[PDB]
């Protein structure tokens, strides 16, 4: 057993707050905000050795990242930003920092009760997205 065992599995979105405002702060345009804000993704997290894979599947976009903790990678986000990403585990929280164009956003994922809680921060704006097991 290991690092991310309590994250592994298939998760479904059950609530979202302030996501449109988070996307505005990130610079996402109107039409993408509308369609992405409507999405109800399933998030699939798996581990194989040191490599963690996170898939997001929805009617809007399907994305996949694979990474090693602490090791930067280039990522194309669902909204088509080209970012440099680093994901670490800090006190049991997966912390995902994305850098692009002199900007930065941080996505934190944590287990709380039977939920996986995702907090997305861009400057002063936070969005909270709650997932349950599928
Ligand atoms: O993995 C997704 C993802 C993938 C496919 C669909 C959707 Br909806 C979300 N993330 C990262 C997790 C935290 C939410 S922000 C985000 N992507 C977006 C960022 C800006 C605008 C639109 C989507």
Curated annotation (Swiss-Prot):
One of its GO terms (cellular component) is cytosol. Keywords: Acetylation, Cytoplasm, Lipid-binding, Nucleus, Phosphoprotein, Transport. Transmembrane segments: none annotated. SUPFAM superfamilies: Lipocalins. Belongs to the calycin superfamily. Fatty-acid binding protein (FABP) family. PANTHER family: FATTY ACID BINDING PROTEIN. The modification N-acetylcysteine is found at residue 4. One of its GO terms (biological process) is cholesterol homeostasis. This is Fatty acid-binding protein, adipocyte.
